[PDB]
Design a protein around this ligand. Structure first.
Ligand SMILES: *[C]C1=C([C])[C]=[C@@]23C(=[C]1)N([C][C]([O])[C]([O])[C]([O])[C]OP([O])(=O)OP([O])(=O)O[C][C]1O[C](N4[C]=NC5=C4N=[C]N=C5[N])[C]([O])[C]1[O])C1=NC(=O)[N]C(=O)[C@@]14=N2[C@]43#C[C]N([C])[C][C][C]OC1=[C][C]=C(Cl)[C]=C1Cl
Length: 490
C-alpha cells in the first residue's frame, strides 16, 4: 500500500519508467485506469485475425529506443510489404507507383524543401526558441502551406499530409509546431518514408506485447482498473488517490498519462497556472483505424503492394498499408479514416463504414473482390475515454510559445513523461520510451542513483535496423519555385 515512486499510467511510457526504476531496485507501482496495459497501442487478439494491432504499429530506422526495448523483451520485427506499385487516387482516376504537372511538381518539391530547410532552425528541445518562434507559432499550417504553394494540387497534397501525419486538419495547428514535429521525427523523408518503397516494420505478434511483457516483469506491482484523480503532494509523504478511493503513498509520482487527462487530475497543491493552462489547451487528433480482411490478396494479383494515397473529399480512407500477416496468411488492408473525416464518420454504424470503405477500395484497386470482405476490425480513438485521441497531443496556434516552454517541467515531486513530453520521435512509441526513461532517471537522480548530466542518455543506433542518412538530388535543391520563376520573368 506504500511505495518509492508511483507511475500514473501503463502505456509504453509509464511502463518504460517502471521497468527502469526497477532496474535500479526502487519500489515502483503503476496505476492504469483500463483493464489492460498498452494505452494507444492495443492488440486485439481474436481467431478471425490471429493478432492485430489497432494503435501503435510501425517502427522504423532511427527509432532506436523502442527497437532496443522491444528486442530485449524478446519481440521480433518484420518488414511491411511495399514491393509492388503504390496507388494514387485523385480526380477519380488511379495512378500506380506515384508521389504529372511541372509547375505543380516545382511547387511540390519546393514545398517539402521549404519545410525542411525551414525546420533547420528549430531546437527540438525547446522549439519555442527558434528564431521565428513568435511569428511561426502565430501562423497556422494552412496559412504557411498556402504561402509556400502556388498550385492547388500541391497545396492539396500538403493537406492530407498534415492530416496523415498529425491526424488533424491544418487550419487547426501551429505553423511552428508542425515544423518542429516533422523535425524531431527527422523531417519529411523519415516521417513519411517510402516513395517507390522503403521501410516500415511492425512487431511480430502485435506491439501490445511491448507493454504486456513489462507488466510481467512487475507482476502485481501494476494495479489495473485504477484511475488516478488526486495527487495530494503536500506533506513529505505523497498521498495519491484513485477513483475507487484506493489510496497509495510515495515520494515521487510520475505523470505518464497524456496532457489532456493530466489536466483532469486534482493536484493538491495546484499545478502552477502557466502549465495548468498548457495542459488544458492541448487537444488530441482524430482517427479511425480500419482493418479490411480478405481471403485472397488480390491487390497483389493486380500489381499494387496494397497502399494508396487517396486524395478525394468523400473517400473515407485517406491512407493505406497492406496488413497481411508476415507469413502470407490472412490477407488484409489497413486504412486510416482521419482528422475531420474521423469526426464525420464516427457517428456512423460500424457496418456502414465497412461498406463505404469497401466501395472505395473497390473503385481504387479496380477489383470487385474488394466488395466482398471477410472480416472487419476497427478502433475509434476519438471515442477513447482514457486517451482522448490518436496519435498525439497537437498544438493550436500561439500556445506553443505561450505556455509551450513547460510541457515537461518537473513540479514538486511529480515529474512528467509520455510521448507528448518526448523530444526525438515525439508522438510515436519510440518517443514514449524516451520519455519514460527520462522521467525515471529524474526520480532516480533525485534519489541519488543517477547524476544530473546523467539524466539524458544518448541512444546507440540499433545495429539491427540501421537508419540511412538521406539524399537530396541536385534539382531538388536547385530548381526554382513558382514564387521564384516569376522574378526570373520579372
Ligand atoms: C492510436 C494510434 C494510431 C491509430 C496510430 C499510431 C499511433 C497510435 N501511434 C502513437 C503511439 O501509440 C503513442 O505515441 C504512444 O503509444 C502513447 O503512449 P504513452 O506515452 O504511454 O501514452 P498512452 O499509451 O496513451 O498511455 C497512458 C495510460 O494512462 C492511463 N490513464 C489515463 N487516465 C488515467 C490513466 N491512468 C491512471 N489515472 C488516470 N486518470 C490510460 O489507461 C493509458 O493507458 C504510433 N506510434 C508509433 O511509434 N508507430 C505508429 O505506427 C503509431 N501509430 C501511428 C501512426 C503513424 N502514422 C499513421 C503515420 C506514420 C506511418 O504512416 C504511414 C507511413 C507510410 C504509409 Cl504508406 C502509410 C502510412 Cl499511414
Amino acid at each position: 500500500h506504500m511505495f518509492d515512486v508511483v507511475v500514473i499510467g501503463g502505456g509504453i511510457s509509464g511502463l518504460s519508467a517502471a521497468k527502469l526504476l526497477t532496474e535500479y531496485g526502487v519500489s515502483v507501482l503503476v496505476l492504469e485506469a483500463r483493464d489492460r496495459v498498452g494505452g494507444r497501442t492495443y492488440t486485439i487478439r481474436n481467431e478471425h485475425v490471429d493478432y492485430v494491432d489497432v494503435g501503435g504499429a510501425y517502427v522504423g530506422p532511427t527509432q532506436n529506443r523502442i527497437l532496443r526495448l522491444s528486442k530485449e523483451l524478446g519481440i521480433e520485427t518484420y518488414k511491411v510489404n511495399v514491393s509492388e506499385r503504390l496507388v494514387q487516387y485523385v480526380k477519380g482516376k488511379t495512378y500506380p507507383f506515384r508521389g504529372w504537372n511541372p509547375i505543380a511538381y516545382l511547387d511540390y518539391n519546393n514545398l517539402w524543401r521549404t519545410i525542411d530547410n525551414m525546420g533547420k532552425e528549430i531546437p527540438t528541445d525547446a522549439p519555442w526558441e527558434a528564431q521565428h518562434a513568435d511569428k511561426w507559432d502565430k501562423m497556422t499550417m494552412k496559412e504557411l502551406i498556402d504561402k509556400i504553394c502556388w498550385t492547388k494540387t500541391a497545396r492539396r497534397f500538403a493537406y492530407l499530409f498534415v492530416n496523415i501525419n498529425v491526424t488533424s486538419e491544418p487550419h487547426e495547428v501551429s505553423a511552428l509546431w508542425f515544423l518542429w514535429y516533422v523535425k524531431q521525427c527527422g523531417g519529411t523523408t523519415r516521417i513519411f518514408s517510402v516513395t517507390n518503397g522503403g521501410q516500415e516494420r511492425k512487431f511480430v505478434g502485435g506491439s501490445g506485447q511491448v507493454s504486456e511483457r513489462i507488466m510481467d516483469l512487475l507482476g502485481d506491482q501494476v494495479k489495473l482498473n485504477h484511475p488516478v484523480t488526486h495527487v495530494d503532494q503536500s506533506s513529505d509523504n505523497i498521498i495519491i488517490e484513485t477513483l475507487n478511493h484506493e489510496h497509495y503513498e510515495c515520494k515521487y509520482v510520475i505523470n505518464a498519462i497524456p496532457p489532456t487527462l493530466t489536466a483532469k487530475i486534482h493536484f493538491r497543491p495546484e499545478l502552477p497556472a502557466e502549465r495548468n493552462q498548457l495542459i488544458q489547451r492541448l487537444p488530441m487528433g482524430a482517427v479511425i483505424k480500419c482493418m479490411m480482411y480478405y481471403k485472397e490478396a488480390f491487390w497483389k494479383k493486380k500489381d499494387y503492394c496494397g497502399c494508396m494515397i487517396i486524395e478525394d473529399e468523400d473517400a473515407p480512407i485517406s491512407i493505406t498499408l497492406d496488413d497481411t500477416k508476415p507469413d502470407g496468411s490472412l490477407p488484409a488492408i489497413m486504412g486510416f479514416i482521419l482528422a475531420r473525416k474521423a469526426d464525420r464518420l464516427a457517428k456512423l454504424h460500424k457496418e456502414i463504414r465497412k461498406k463505404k470503405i469497401c466501395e472505395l477500395y473497390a473503385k481504387v484497386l479496380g477489383s470487385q473482390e474488394a466488395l466482398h470482405p471477410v472480416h472487419y476490425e476497427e478502433k475509434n480513438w476519438c471515442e477513447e475515454q482514457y486517451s482522448g485521441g490518436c496519435y498525439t497531443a497537437y498544438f493550436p496556434p500561439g500556445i506553443m510559445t505561450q505556455y509551450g516552454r513547460v510541457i515537461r517541467q518537473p513540479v514538486g515531486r511529480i515529474f512528467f513523461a509520455g510521448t507528448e513530453t518526448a523530444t526525438k520521435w515525439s508522438g510515436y512509441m519510440e518517443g514514449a520510451v524516451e520519455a519514460g526513461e527520462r522521467a525515471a532517471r529524474e526520480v532516480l537522480n533525485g534519489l541519488g542513483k543517477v547524476t544530473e548530466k546523467d539524466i539524458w542518455v544518448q541512444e546507440p543506433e540499433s545495429k539491427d535496423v540501421p537508419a540511412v542518412e538521406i539524399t537530396h538530388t541536385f534539382w531538388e535543391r536547385n530548381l526554382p519555385s513558382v514564387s521564384g520563376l516569376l522574378k526570373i520573368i520579372g
